[PDB]
Amino acid sequence: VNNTIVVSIGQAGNQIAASFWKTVCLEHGIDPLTGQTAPGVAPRGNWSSFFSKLGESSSGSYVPRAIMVDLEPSVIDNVKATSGSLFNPANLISRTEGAGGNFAVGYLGAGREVLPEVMSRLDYEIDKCDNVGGIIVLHAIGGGTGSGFGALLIESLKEKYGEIPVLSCAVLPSPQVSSVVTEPYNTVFALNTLRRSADACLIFDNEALFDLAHRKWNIESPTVDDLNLLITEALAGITASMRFSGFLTVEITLRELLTNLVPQPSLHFLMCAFAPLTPPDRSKFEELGIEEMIKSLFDNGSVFAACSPMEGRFLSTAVLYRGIMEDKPLADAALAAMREKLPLTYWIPTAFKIGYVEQPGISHRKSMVLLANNTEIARVLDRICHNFDKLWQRKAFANWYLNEGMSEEQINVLRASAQELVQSYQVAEESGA
Amino acid sequence: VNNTIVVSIGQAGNQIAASFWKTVCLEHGIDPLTGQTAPGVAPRGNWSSFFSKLGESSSGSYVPRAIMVDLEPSVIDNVKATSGSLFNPANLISRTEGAGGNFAVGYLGAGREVLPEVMSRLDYEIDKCDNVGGIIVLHAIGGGTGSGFGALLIESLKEKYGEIPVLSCAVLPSPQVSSVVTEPYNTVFALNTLRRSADACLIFDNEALFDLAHRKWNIESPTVDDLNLLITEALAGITASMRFSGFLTVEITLRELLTNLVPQPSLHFLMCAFAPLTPPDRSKFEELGIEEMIKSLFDNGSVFAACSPMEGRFLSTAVLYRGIMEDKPLADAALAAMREKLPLTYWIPTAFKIGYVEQPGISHRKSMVLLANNTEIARVLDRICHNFDKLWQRKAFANWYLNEGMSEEQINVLRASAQELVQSYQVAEESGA
Amino acid sequence: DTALERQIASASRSVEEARRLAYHDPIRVGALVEQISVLADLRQKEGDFRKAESLYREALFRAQELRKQDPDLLTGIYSLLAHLYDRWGRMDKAAEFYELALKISAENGLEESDKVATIKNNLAMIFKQLRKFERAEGYYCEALETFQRLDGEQSARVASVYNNLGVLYYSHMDVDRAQVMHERALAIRQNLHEGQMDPADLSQTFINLGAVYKAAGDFQKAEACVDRAKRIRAAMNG
Amino acid sequence: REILSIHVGQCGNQIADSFWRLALREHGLTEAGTLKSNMEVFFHKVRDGKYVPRAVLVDLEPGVIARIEGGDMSQLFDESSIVRKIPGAANNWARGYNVEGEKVIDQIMNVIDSAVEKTKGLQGFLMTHSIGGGSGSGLGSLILERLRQAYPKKRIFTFSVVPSPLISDSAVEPYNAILTLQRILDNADGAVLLDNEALFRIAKAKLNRSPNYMDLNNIIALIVSSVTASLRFPGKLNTDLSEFVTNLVPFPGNHFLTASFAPMQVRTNFPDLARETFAQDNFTAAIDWQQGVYLAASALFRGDVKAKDVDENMATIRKSLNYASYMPASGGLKLGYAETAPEGFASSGLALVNHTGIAAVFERLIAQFDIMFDNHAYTHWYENAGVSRDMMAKARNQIATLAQSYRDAS
Amino acid sequence: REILSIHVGQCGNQIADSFWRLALREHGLTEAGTLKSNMEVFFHKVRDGKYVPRAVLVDLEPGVIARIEGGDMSQLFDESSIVRKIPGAANNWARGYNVEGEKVIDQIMNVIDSAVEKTKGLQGFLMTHSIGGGSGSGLGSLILERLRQAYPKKRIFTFSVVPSPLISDSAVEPYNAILTLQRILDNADGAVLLDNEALFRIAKAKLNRSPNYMDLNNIIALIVSSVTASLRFPGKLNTDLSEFVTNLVPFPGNHFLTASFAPMQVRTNFPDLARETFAQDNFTAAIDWQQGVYLAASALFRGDVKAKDVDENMATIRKSLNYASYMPASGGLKLGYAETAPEGFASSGLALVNHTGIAAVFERLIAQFDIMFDNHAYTHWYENAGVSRDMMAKARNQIATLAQSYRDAS
Numbered sequence A, B: 001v002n003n004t005i006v007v008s009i010g011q012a013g014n015q016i017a018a019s020f021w022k023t024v025c026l027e028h029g030i031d032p033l034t035g036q037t038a039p040g041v042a043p044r045g046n047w048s049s050f051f052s053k054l055g056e057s058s059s060g061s062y063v064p065r066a067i068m069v070d071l072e073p074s075v076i077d078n079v080k081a082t083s084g085s086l087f088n089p090a091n092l093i094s095r096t097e098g099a100g101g102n103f104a105v106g107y108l109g110a111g112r113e114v115l116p117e118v119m120s121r122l123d124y125e126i127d128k129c130d131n132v133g134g135i136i137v138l139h140a141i142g143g144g145t146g147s148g149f150g151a152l153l154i155e156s157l158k159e160k161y162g163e164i165p166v167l168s169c170a171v172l173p174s175p176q177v178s179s180v181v182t183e184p185y186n187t188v189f190a191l192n193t194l195r196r197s198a199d200a201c202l203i204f205d206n207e208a209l210f211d212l213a214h215r216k217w218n219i220e221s222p223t224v225d226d227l228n229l230l231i232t233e234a235l236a237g238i239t240a241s242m243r244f245s246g247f248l249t250v251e252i253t254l255r256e257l258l259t260n261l262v263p264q265p266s267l268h269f270l271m272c273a274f275a276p277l278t279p280p281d282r283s284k285f286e287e288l289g290i291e292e293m294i295k296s297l298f299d300n301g302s303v304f305a306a307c308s309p310m311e312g313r314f315l316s317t318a319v320l321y322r323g324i325m326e327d328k329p330l331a332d333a334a335l336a337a338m339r340e341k342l343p344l345t346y347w348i349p350t351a352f353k354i355g356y357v358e359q360p361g362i363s364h365r366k367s368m369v370l371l372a373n374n375t376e377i378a379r380v381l382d383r384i385c386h387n388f389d390k391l392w393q394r395k396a397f398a399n400w401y402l403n404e405g406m407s408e409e410q411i412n413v414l415r416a417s418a419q420e421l422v423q424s425y426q427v428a429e430e431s432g433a
Numbered sequence C: 001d002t003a004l005e006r007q008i009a010s011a012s013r014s015v016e017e018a019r020r021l022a023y024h025d026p027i028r029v030g031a032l033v034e035q036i037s038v039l040a041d042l043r044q045k046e047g048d049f050r051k052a053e054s055l056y057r058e059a060l061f062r063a064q065e066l067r068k069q070d071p072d073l074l075t076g077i078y079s080l081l082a083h084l085y086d087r088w089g090r091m092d093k094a095a096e097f098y099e100l101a102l103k104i105s106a107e108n109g110l111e112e113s114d115k116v117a118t119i120k121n122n123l124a125m126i127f128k129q130l131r132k133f134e135r136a137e138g139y140y141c142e143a144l145e146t147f148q149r150l151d152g153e154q155s156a157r158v159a160s161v162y163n164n165l166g167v168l169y170y171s172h173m174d175v176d177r178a179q180v181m182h183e184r185a186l187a188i189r190q191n192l193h194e195g196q197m198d199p200a201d202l203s204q205t206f207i208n209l210g211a212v213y214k215a216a217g218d219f220q221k222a223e224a225c226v227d228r229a230k231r232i233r234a235a236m237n238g
Numbered sequence D, E: 001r002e003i004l005s006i007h008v009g010q011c012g013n014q015i016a017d018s019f020w021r022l023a024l025r026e027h028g029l030t031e032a033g034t035l036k037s038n039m040e041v042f043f044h045k046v047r048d049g050k051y052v053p054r055a056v057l058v059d060l061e062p063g064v065i066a067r068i069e070g071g072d073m074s075q076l077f078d079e080s081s082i083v084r085k086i087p088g089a090a091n092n093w094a095r096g097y098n099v100e101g102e103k104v105i106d107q108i109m110n111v112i113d114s115a116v117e118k119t120k121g122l123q124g125f126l127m128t129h130s131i132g133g134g135s136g137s138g139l140g141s142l143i144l145e146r147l148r149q150a151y152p153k154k155r156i157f158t159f160s161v162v163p164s165p166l167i168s169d170s171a172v173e174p175y176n177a178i179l180t181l182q183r184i185l186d187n188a189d190g191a192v193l194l195d196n197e198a199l200f201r202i203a204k205a206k207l208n209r210s211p212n213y214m215d216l217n218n219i220i221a222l223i224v225s226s227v228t229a230s231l232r233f234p235g236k237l238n239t240d241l242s243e244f245v246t247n248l249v250p251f252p253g254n255h256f257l258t259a260s261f262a263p264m265q266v267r268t269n270f271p272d273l274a275r276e277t278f279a280q281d282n283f284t285a286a287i288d289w290q291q292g293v294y295l296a297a298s299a300l301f302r303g304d305v306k307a308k309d310v311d312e313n314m315a316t317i318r319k320s321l322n323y324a325s326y327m328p329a330s331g332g333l334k335l336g337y338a339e340t341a342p343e344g345f346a347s348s349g350l351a352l353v354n355h356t357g358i359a360a361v362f363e364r365l366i367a368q369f370d371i372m373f374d375n376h377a378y379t380h381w382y383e384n385a386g387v388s389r390d391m392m393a394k395a396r397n398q399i400a401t402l403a404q405s406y407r408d409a410s
């Protein structure tokens, strides 16, 4: 089956992937603390999309196709304490110093040091794959490692392989408050890579992921244990078509997902949404039907993004149903109303790539995942382009980017290369209007 | 052939008809759980008296001419679980609320609601008939549905058609204990209909049907599975002349049966009896000859009625032999002794309408069925007339009959109309003495 | 299977969800009210007014049980019951319930609130129907001042109260004051084009000006108004 | 034919812990609500597996449901099918009917209405409470008004628990019955009066263990189930809830029924179950016997009870019984069957008996009311909470009529 | 007269699970391939009992056959009659035709050639796919080239499934039709265009159950069988595959057929089956009707259908139909019969209808192509995988000719 590697860069990408392989292993009926399945019985679903057979005894551990890369040791040592013998600890690479909001440490620095060791483990995974057809890099677009080495690694991987999708499932900076002081820098330095050398960059935003766990999962303080579960359940939702060969499962590979969702090579920043956002308190009589999950998919406060999705133009949309469906013609006819309700872009007549997966989610029985390639995703990056310029008219922080090896000529290119990105939806908004 | 509809009202009428169409289908060599016959071969006997050709492939189901009506859903859903695709499920009408010993729910109430739907299915059956010559309504004269809607339906059917016999094969209240607290009410309210607008009311009594399965079918506790088989074998005995065109079968239609058994329009309450009451344990060397079945027909504890038959006057008698007979002159000469033994009514010189059917019964090889129009059948209804008056001097239960739409003036009419019934045999007893 | 039955099923689930939420967390009363308003609307549309009333009473009991009393919430709930009574045709009860709302606000801080100005407007309208002109005028003026202080003079809500006063004065044949009111309403309504005001309100103002000018003996300006209303109502077909 | 249930008061909700642990056993469900028969009657089918019951656990003093929804049964009940509010209808009818009743009655009805608009064949209300306290009898008197005013054509069966004749158990308790027995007489189509003196004794002969109000309620919770188990376990002689009003309630006042259970997997050969069912000591009320003739008895025999036996057993029983003069010789006793016994039993029996003896329960509760009302003996707790003496003497003049309506029915 | 079958794409292989479970039923075989009629048509006689079908289960994304050859049908298909390869022709014509197509097409043809050198009377190709995806439409477009280049004198019937007019179901799907409908128009002798909007509706009226793509394909799998059941269940008026090109395809472009099935063991009296067969709502495409006149309809009535009835039924139907002006008065409708109905039915019907309405399917798929191609709206996935805009606009200029070729045929 189409194998797929989940590379986990940075603290924000690892702590998603700490919770992502918790989910995926529990999704395949595999113990997430040992790597071994239930004794003697096969794992449910098609395990070999993400996993690898370690030991031919049918009860041994299944090592996930996952390299966890971060320049700070405390993140993966948290994972090594909370995974046991699940991961391959040759893939759980760590360093000492860290990056610390400095792009030019993850990209050209301590991340340059790990790059001969990281790529010597992707080559270990890919040669171990049957035929790998996607690489899901989990990082943030805010830090020094996830946005630094994530910009390095993806440009070190399509440059090497190139015939493989790189879905950079990434976490944008929240606009409510910046978790890094150099966070509108580090995005624009990664928007060089995540525009040019990544086939798609699935965004997530920490503001919207707070609101979708506070107002929707009805808790007071949504921790990062639950931000990395809203993301996870979406990342374990877009990859349910990759991992399951069921009844009428529309088996969507990453390339099969991105041919439907990347219209032209500079329009591949995808948002996401999940349904139902019913809390896990067993609201059984309030479980949502398919006619009303799609009504809750496309709310303005339902996507995992700072922008307002229905205030702009949905350019390419991919609604990935996942679970027990009784109603195929009631499916796709709710989207027929949503073809009328939602702002679409003629420039495209119709775009709803609809996945079914009969294997249900862990938390949900009838779960829906959206991937709307929106034009509003430039309006998230309009904030980042503006917060860059306020920190470039002053020529902000200091030498911190410049002493590591970057130049003022290069930084103005990458601002333009993010300006070329933001205009590339502004090209596609009014022409799509 | 003369088609004949078996309408099944109430729980007591349906559970007879649940077992009646078990018998009749097995009697015609038709599977009672699918409706289809044995593959390729025709059903034995003349199927089209009770059945209908559904699908012209000669192996498809034969839908019986039967509408099952009851205001409680659990009775017909028991039949739908125990008939399969035999009945036409447009005829298996059910409701939710039920009647519950209230005549004025089956007659003027929830039974009034089903009456446009019930009569739209009798019209479906009758138009499907070749030329229908009898309607055998199976109910009880005790409940709120069988005695309520059975009083409604029969007055809604002779009022509509009128040129058709209505043999209300009905189950009187047992005098040993009342299964309904308003059971001597509900009879007298149905003795309006079953005297006036029914051409005959074949009675059955749950006391005698216990004794004829305990003392005769030698079991300890006769269940309602075996009350509805003593009745059934009698109802599949009076209808063997209707359904079989054999060697020397005296083909007795309902009108052909009631011209011999209804002397004047207020004397059409008929008892019944069956012979042999040999248990089904294969008492082969104790199988009864025709000279001694007739000795067991006319015992006091041999009729399906609370009254003692030989203690009163047999007004019109119809002994329906059914099975393999070797002895035609030994037949009818046993009845020549029974012309002398039995109390007959000059007022009639002779009355023994004698059916032969060469097609034998399922349970019996030489089976005999009696239909004695007795004068004692007022003595069953003398009990009901007395138990009405004890519950009318007090003006019993409450508003339950009166709030539904009935009046105290109407109820005193129907007591008189049952007093006109009881005196109508008291007219015919001493004048027949 | 009917569209209304579908809307009810959806609105009921949504209410049941907010009920359960307020079981787990008794503080979340405001959201229950919102969900209730939608379901109560639907019950009114089908004519089940007692069901609608029960929903609002339930909302009210939850609000009353809060350990920290929320007078603003109670004010709003009473005004929803008042409006329910009004649509039901129970005119006295509608006035009584708006008055209860106002009394709760007057006793706490909320004299100069959004809700209170709305209530005074709606109450004034009921007083017009009760044929109590002086009481209607009083409340309309208070609603007018409060909206003036809360929103600019240039707002939809100010123009609405101007309009309502206009109709009040017109109905008691004070033609002069009717004119002033409707012109002030016209002035504001012209300067406010977007989704902050639909054009059908602008047409009502011309319609109302038409009847006022006609009553004033200026049949010329009357027809000019009636014309411009017709132009507007026509122009919203496209 | 899907019966809503209401469990008001501490007495009723403690039966709800007994009833919905016996309704789950007879339908064969686990305690969480999922599948381990017409299950549609008591249970609303939310999903394919989970069956949420059609019960409101309406209650003041919210510690009773904290026992229910704390330990083992929190997943079962829906929490939009409940009400919990402090204060606690302070064993005071006027708190339960007027003060803390009007706070919850908009929430009670809109939770009933959200449970009966999911129905698809609503027939009845097994409203379970006592006529003794202030929540079961006060708010129980208020729900009966508002439910009959909302559903005037549906049968409302009240499953009361009378104050004990033995001692009080509450001081103002004979006030709280007559203020409730008014509204039961005005609204409910038939009430089952149960008595904790008889529920102590019959459970004392049942168990080799001194009972408690969990063990007492399992006598009630079978009677609550056996009344409506010919409605959901059909069998033969299908007796719905509409036939417990037409058959057992002769006059428009005499609708207070005295129900027994038998046997008290337990098998019983059944010539003696009918002698156990209509034992005078097995009826669950301190009704009068030496000056008491029945009006209309019932007999719902469930399980492995075949109908041939009642022609020999029940006709023998009805000769042993004492009916009114205006009831016929072998008649006056309706019957029914179910095709499934309760879990733990193999052949059960029930007997709703409408009897003049239940007026002795009424005459006790008036003779207690007679002294206690004229001397203002707890009256100011009603007067200073909404309910005047005019409203309370008028409650007496119906029950004094009702205690006479059985003496007129002899 | 032994028809090879090809099942390319997830859409086609899911029909193969429906078709070879209906081909085994109509020939009366078990699911393993052995004997439980001309069985030589679909099935290669390997041994005396076991009949291996003449199907290639050609597929990318090898999880579809993992459903087939995992559960209950692994013993049926020969595994030298298959191809399974990752990656999965990524809903991308250029992956299916050029990138991952040229990897498998040497294996596809040499498995076809190993299946047609076992024949002994090869006549046709029931090649089953969709024109929507990248495997069924991409590699389906490649097989049609290589099979016509290898067998230019054999009838190649394409059983397509059109993209829905309702919504997309794939983003780049109007590209993948016109890139495929070119090669169907160039190579295949007659195509049956089916539509999942009509397959939803007609199955919705069939079942009392909301359909799925297993239930939708049983409408197709009967149509796939009923076309070629006058070829294997002979009867009278033997219609082979050579008569669906000469009779139903007037001009050298108009070979896209809209097939219905009726009845939708089910018996039908047959004056109404002909009214059900040529119901406008029973045709399995969203063809135009208010601006649509037929060219050439067919009627394959199988089972217990005797030929005297069509002189009264079908002559009545053809008066109700709308043909072109250049078709005769009672003519223009060919007929056929089989002596054996499908299992489960007793008298079936089929209707291959060549109609100008199928150009409205073409006009939709060009009007979607018109906006989407000029704005490069998914074009770079073809350009960066072999297929240029010159190769794709040339695909449009044949289908824009083809959409005109029906408007020239009115």
Ligand SMILES: Nc1nc2c(ncn2[C@@H]2O[C@H](COP(=O)(O)OP(=O)(O)O)[C@@H](O)[C@H]2O)c(=O)[nH]1
Residues within 6 Å of the ligand: A010, A011, A012, A013, A015, A016, A070, A072, A099, A100, A101, A140, A141, A142, A143, A144, A145, A146, A147, A148, A171, A173, A174, A178, A179, A180, A183, A206, A224, A225, A227, A228, A231
């Ligand atoms: N969703 C999610 N986001 C996180 C988490 N931890 C950090 N982030 C975000 O990730 C961004 C950058 O942190 P990171 O890349 O881990 O810094 P680095 O390790 O120095 O590269 C910050 O803006 C945080 O808001 C987490 O656990 N989940």
Ligand SMILES: Nc1nc2c(ncn2[C@@H]2O[C@H](COP(=O)(O)OP(=O)(O)O)[C@@H](O)[C@H]2O)c(=O)[nH]1
Residues within 6 Å of the ligand: B010, B011, B012, B013, B015, B016, B070, B072, B099, B100, B101, B140, B141, B142, B143, B144, B145, B146, B147, B148, B171, B173, B174, B178, B179, B180, B183, B206, B224, B225, B227, B228, B231, D236, D237, D238
């Ligand atoms: N023979 C026979 N009689 C029955 C059966 N079930 C009930 N009965 C009798 O029918 C009478 C009335 O019951 P029924 O009409 O079914 O009540 P309803 O459904 O409420 O109208 C009772 O007196 C029972 O004795 C049965 O299965 N067979």
Ligand SMILES: Nc1nc2c(ncn2[C@@H]2O[C@H](COP(=O)(O)OP(=O)(O)O)[C@@H](O)[C@H]2O)c(=O)[nH]1
Residues within 6 Å of the ligand: D008, D009, D010, D011, D012, D014, D015, D088, D089, D090, D091, D129, D130, D131, D132, D133, D134, D135, D136, D137, D138, D161, D163, D164, D168, D169, D170, D173, D196, D199, D213, D214, D216, D217, D220
């Ligand atoms: N059968 C039964 N009776 C009870 C139970 N709990 C209390 N009682 C009796 O019910 C009567 C009324 O108390 P109750 O109505 O619970 O008070 P309230 O809930 O505050 O209105 C008391 O006299 C108790 O003897 C119980 O669980 N079962």
Ligand SMILES: Nc1nc2c(ncn2[C@@H]2O[C@H](COP(=O)(O)OP(=O)(O)O)[C@@H](O)[C@H]2O)c(=O)[nH]1
Residues within 6 Å of the ligand: E008, E009, E010, E011, E012, E014, E015, E088, E089, E090, E091, E129, E130, E131, E132, E133, E134, E135, E136, E137, E138, E161, E163, E164, E168, E169, E170, E173, E196, E199, E213, E214, E216, E217, E220
């Ligand atoms: N009739 C039918 N249509 C299907 C089935 N599965 C998918 N489809 C439709 O076929 C179209 C093409 O998908 P497909 O060709 O399977 O993708 P590919 O195999 O990756 O080329 C989609 O638009 C689906 O709506 C099926 O089993 N039956």
